[PDB]
Amino acid sequence: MSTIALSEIVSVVNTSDGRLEVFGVGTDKAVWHNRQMAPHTGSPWSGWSSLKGQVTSKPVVYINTDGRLEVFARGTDNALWHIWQTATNAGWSNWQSLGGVITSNPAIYANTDGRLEVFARGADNALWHISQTTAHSGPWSSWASLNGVITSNPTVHINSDGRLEVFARGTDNALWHIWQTAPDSNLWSSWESLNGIITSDPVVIDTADGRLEVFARGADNALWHIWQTISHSGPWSGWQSLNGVITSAPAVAKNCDNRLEAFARGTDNALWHTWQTVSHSGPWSSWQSLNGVITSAPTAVRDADGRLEVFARGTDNALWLTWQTASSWSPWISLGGVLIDASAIK
Amino acid sequence: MSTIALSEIVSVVNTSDGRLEVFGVGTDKAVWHNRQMAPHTGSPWSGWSSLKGQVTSKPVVYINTDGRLEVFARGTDNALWHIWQTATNAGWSNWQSLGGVITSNPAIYANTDGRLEVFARGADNALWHISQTTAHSGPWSSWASLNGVITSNPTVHINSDGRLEVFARGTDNALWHIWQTAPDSNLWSSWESLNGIITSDPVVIDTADGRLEVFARGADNALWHIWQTISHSGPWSGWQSLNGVITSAPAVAKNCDNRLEAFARGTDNALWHTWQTVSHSGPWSSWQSLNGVITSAPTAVRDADGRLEVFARGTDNALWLTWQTASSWSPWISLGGVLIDASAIK
Ligand SMILES: CO[C@@H]1O[C@@H](C)[C@@H](O)[C@@H](O)[C@@H]1O
Ligand SMILES: CO[C@@H]1O[C@@H](C)[C@@H](O)[C@@H](O)[C@@H]1O
Ligand SMILES: CO[C@@H]1O[C@@H](C)[C@@H](O)[C@@H](O)[C@@H]1O
Ligand SMILES: CO[C@@H]1O[C@@H](C)[C@@H](O)[C@@H](O)[C@@H]1O
Ligand SMILES: [Cl-]
Ligand SMILES: [Cl-]
Ligand SMILES: [Cl-]
Ligand SMILES: [Cl-]
Ligand SMILES: [Cl-]
Ligand SMILES: [Cl-]
Ligand SMILES: [Cl-]
Ligand SMILES: [Cl-]
Ligand SMILES: [Cl-]
Ligand SMILES: [Cl-]
Ligand SMILES: [Cl-]
Ligand SMILES: [Cl-]
Ligand SMILES: [Cl-]
Ligand SMILES: [Cl-]
Ligand SMILES: [Cl-]
Ligand SMILES: [Cl-]
Ligand code: NA
Ligand code: NA
Ligand code: NA
Ligand code: NA
Ligand code: NA
Ligand code: NA
Ligand code: NA
Ligand code: NA
């Protein structure tokens, strides 16, 4: 090789054969990827390989229900583009355009029927969407709008009853959301406010007990969170603070035993984290340091050994990596590369 | 409230809200279920509740891609019957017939497009199948045959590339299998032999690295296993012995960190187990005892705290339960009930 907290720089997944794969953007705007050779913590890596393209968003990878990776990104023409594996253990298609004009990073989820659906802000600052017409395959539907006015990158998750739900910051800086009223459908609720004042993109995750929980940096630069109180249903909890003082977007992942763990850059530019103790219903720890000097938000994922691995850009613009050990965490190692923050919203 | 090793007596799942739910059969041939109140190891249980019906197979629960449980069982008329949740946190439909004439327990998996497909032996001892015509819903297709001649209950899994694959003992007592040539399709391979001599129903599981691995009791009453050598592909390994002397069918589950663990009744009628050490690619332990005096094969599942829980019938015909603790395993406790082995093949 109008603002939000500093973004995550890579998109990462644990793939169908248990290997982590990371996607980023280089200075000449191509998408690059790196993957583990073996399905274990501390595996050697491929090194960075270019998938070409010319992107103007964060590239976002998603796993189709047949196991094939597909990467979505905004192009220089502001259309949504994508590229996909022709088989789970094979090569890639060419980059192809799905048209439209978009103004955020794309957000992707599979419906219960296997059709990917993609969400992205439009030129009008509404949330637009487009979907595969058949499971894990093109061709795609026409674009349409779910309205609203949003000021952050959107994030989508699936409820435990199969209904997609999308979250995004509004013009009043509150967290807003909208949901499918039935799985696989084009029937959506109205937008509703969950209030709060947020200063990062929201992060959403499903708990062990089937509730959506959303994390975001607050107006005080603490990490805050809010959750569904009943599985796949409102009412939501109040916003609750997890404290800390964070200088990037947060990242969240589940441990082996479903205990949630949040990561973010701190005031000293080190990686910090806080986790649930005891169980997935337990109280959160104090914030503790994992060291490093990072120039992006962290990106967290659980590997095939059930350990968390965290990636973040370094002062040299390489991607660095630390992971959980029995005792502690490993020292930061470099995966090299030269990565940029290509986020469509900053 | 012509033979195979003693069966598992209940069907168990970790549900969309993280609670274990178990399904069995009572002396008057109704299906009963029991569920955890809370999504944690050692949760109190509902106790046994009747779903009615009159069944002549093991009842087998499967989770639809919208999170709704659906239970399948052979009826007194030898047709396939089923009953389903009307919503993930709600009640059940009435029992409804999907017709056909079947001679094994049903085996179920969701295609990548969300359509359940059910496999069962016919009166001709071939493998027949039927599927939902749309994702997570009826109506269902017509019945059709995938041929073969089988002598055990069949088991189905999905490959890491989304192709269903079914395993069953043949007339020569070898393990045979057959697979979809494409996800979601009605295009199947020929039946092929994986050789060996097996004396239980086969158990199939996906490894962390996307390979199918099959377990079964051998002619020597040891536990044996065999696996795909490449993710979602042949060639298969040789049959390899895990030793032991087992007096029931084996059960297998994955730990938190993806380490496989096998369970079976021993010559002393206690529960015994053997596990991978170190990681999901590590060597297997010696067989060790979990005590108890059991009158069925064990049934193993990972709970929402990432601990294994094992269920087995006791000398009083109640269902008993032991689970992993930090140090060891818990003492057996009774969930009550009076359960029978309703397996369509014994
Ligand atoms: C539907 O409501 C519109 O979109 C929301 C997400 C908010 O930005 C709100 O201020 C705006 O009026
Ligand atoms: C531990 O190493 C420190 O953190 C890494 C993430 C890099 O920024 C490196 O330049 C720095 O010395
Ligand atoms: C297709 O082959 C048929 O079915 C297999 C599963 C075996 O029972 C074999 O002996 C029989 O001839
Ligand atoms: C530990 O308790 C023993 O095992 C249970 C599974 C039951 O069979 C019980 O009758 C027996 O005393
Ligand atoms: Cl580049
Ligand atoms: Cl190496
Ligand atoms: Cl290209
Ligand atoms: Cl509102
Ligand atoms: Cl997210
Ligand atoms: Cl703190
Ligand atoms: Cl995994
Ligand atoms: Cl940059
Ligand atoms: Cl009964
Ligand atoms: Cl209690
Ligand atoms: Cl009924
Ligand atoms: Cl053959
Ligand atoms: Cl199985
Ligand atoms: Cl041994
Ligand atoms: Cl779970
Ligand atoms: Cl019995
Ligand atoms: Na991979
Ligand atoms: Na995986
Ligand atoms: Na998402
Ligand atoms: Na994001
Ligand atoms: Na449940
Ligand atoms: Na679950
Ligand atoms: Na199965
Ligand atoms: Na079985």
B257/A257 CB distance under 8 A:
no
The answer to whether the annotation marks B275 as part of a ligand binding site is no
- From first CA to last CA, the distance across chain A in angstroms is 23
> Resolution in angstroms, to 1 decimal, for this deposition?
1.9
Which of B37, B112, B261 to probe by mutation at the A interface, max A CB count within 10 Å?
B112
> Which residues from A are below 8 Å from B260, CB to CB?
none
Chain A residue set in contact with B, beta carbons under 8 Å: 16-19, 39-40, 64-68, 87-89, 111-114, 134-136, 160-162, 183-184, 207-210, 230-232, 255-258, 279-281, 304-307
Cα within 13 Å of Cα(B23), Cβ side: 26
The structure's method of determination equals X-ray
The answer to whether the annotation marks B191 as part of a ligand binding site is no
Tokens 């195979």 — which residue?
A: B4
- From first CA to last CA, the distance across chain B in angstroms is 23
> Residue B9 Cα, ligand 20 centroid: separation in angstroms?
9
Query: Are B260 and B254 spatial neighbours (Cβ–Cβ below 8 Å)?
Result: yes
Cα separations in angstroms, B287 against A112, A116, B251, B262, B271: 40, 45, 14, 9, 10
The answer to whether the annotation marks B313 as part of a ligand binding site is no
Dist CA B132 CA A115 (whole Å):
17
Dist CA A80 CA A36 (whole Å):
28
Cα separations in angstroms, A345 against A5, A80, A153, A264, B303: 10, 15, 7, 19, 40
Dist CA B93 CA B68 (whole Å):
11
Concatenating the DSSP letter of every residue in A59-116 gives -EEEE-TTS-EEEEEEBTTS-EEEEEBSSTTS-B---EE----B-S--EEEE-TTS-E
Which stretches of B73-137 are DSSP H helices? Answer: none
Tell me the Ramachandran region of residue A3: left when phi exceeds 0, alpha when psi lies from -120 to 50, beta otherwise. Answer: beta
Residues contacting B295, CB < 8 A, separation 6+: B269, B312, B313, B314, B315, B317
Query: Atom 8, ligand 1: which residue's CA is nearest?
Result: A170
Residues after which chain A is broken (C–N above 2.5 A) are: 1
Q: For residues A187-225, b (16+ Cβ closer than 10 Å) or e, as one string?
A: ebeebeebebbbbbbbbbbbbbbbbbbbbbbbeeeebbb
Q: How far is B166 from chain A (nearest CA, A)?
A: 17
Dist CA B169 CA B173 (whole Å):
6
> Which residues from B are below 8 Å from A231, CB to CB?
16-17, 88-89
Query: Atom 3, ligand 1: which residue's CA is nearest?
Result: A148
Write the DSSP symbol of residue A158.
E
Give which of B109, B281, B216, B15 is closest to A17, Cα–Cα. B281
